[PDB]
């Protein structure tokens, strides 16, 4: 499957793509404002994520640090990134269908649109100013708006027991971005697409 990753932000981002135990394609790349990066993701990939990292420094060997979404200090991510990270999430070719969503369960750093470029389903978007409106206790100094599980580490926010409800913090993310997951047991906002669709992830779509 082809993913085109487009940075429409006015600032540089470092895109990342991983399935948690391995890079997808090259795993990461710098995207200046306006740049597009096309990756290929193997059919059947389950649990892939794409995200943006902000304020990164890397040396000539690809090793460094980012203020949001850092994946163990590597330019080419093999593991998932440190919150806060707005997440584009996907599982491909699962019994004939692709499943896509955007999640704020690990916080929010950059606004995002995640849309098919082939026919047969709709896209999803979270483009509200979540960082600007972020509650004081969730603001991350490096930038971004953390989720409450990252900040407070309770069974309720992290849904550790498999039972949890919405909270004052999850309802904030949900009020600004109804089409993104706001906590682990949120009513799903997953979109079902035809198997083997292609997609575009756009940072700062507005």
Curated annotation (Swiss-Prot):
InterPro entries: Osmotin/thaumatin-like_sf, Thaumatin, Thaumatin_CS. It is found in: Cytoplasmic vesicle. The keyword rRNA-binding does not apply. This is Thaumatin I. PANTHER family: OS03G0233200 PROTEIN. Belongs to the thaumatin family. Its main location: cytoplasm. Keywords: Cytoplasmic vesicle, Disulfide bond, Signal, Taste-modifying protein. It comes from the Eukaryota. Disulfide bonds join 9-204, 56-66, 71-77, 121-193, 126-177, 134-145, 149-158, 159-164. It comes from Thaumatococcus daniellii. The keyword Transferase does not apply. Taste-modifying protein; intensely sweet-tasting. It is 100000 times sweeter than sucrose on a molar basis. One of its GO terms (cellular component) is cytoplasmic vesicle.
């Amino acid at each position: 499957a082809t993913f085109e990753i487009v940075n429409r932000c006015s600032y540089t981002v470092w895109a990342a793509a991983s399935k948690g135990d391995a890079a997808l394609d090259a795993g990461g790349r710098q995207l200046n404002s306006g740049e597009s990066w096309t990756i290929n993701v193997e059919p059947g990939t389950n649990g892939g994520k794409i995200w943006a990292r902000t304020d990164c420094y890397f040396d000539d060997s690809g090793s460094g640090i980012c203020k949001t979404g850092d994946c163990g200090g590597l330019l080419r991510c093999k593991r998932f990134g440190r919150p806060p990270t707005t997440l584009a999430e996907f599982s491909l070719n699962q019994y004939g269908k692709d499943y896509i969503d955007i999640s704020n369960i690990k916080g929010f750093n950059v606004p995002m649109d995640f849309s098919p470029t082939t026919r047969g389903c709709r896209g999803v978007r979270c483009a509200a100013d979540i960082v600007g409106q972020c509650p004081a206790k969730l603001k991350a100094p490096g930038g971004g708006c953390n989720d409450a599980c990252t900040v407070f580490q309770t069974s309720e926010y992290c849904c550790t027991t498999g039972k949890c409800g919405p909270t004052e913090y999850s309802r904030f993310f949900k009020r600004l971005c109804p089409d993104a997951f706001s906590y682990v047991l949120d009513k799903p906002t997953t979109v079902t697409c035809p198997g083997s669709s292609n997609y575009r992830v756009t940072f700062c779509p507005t």
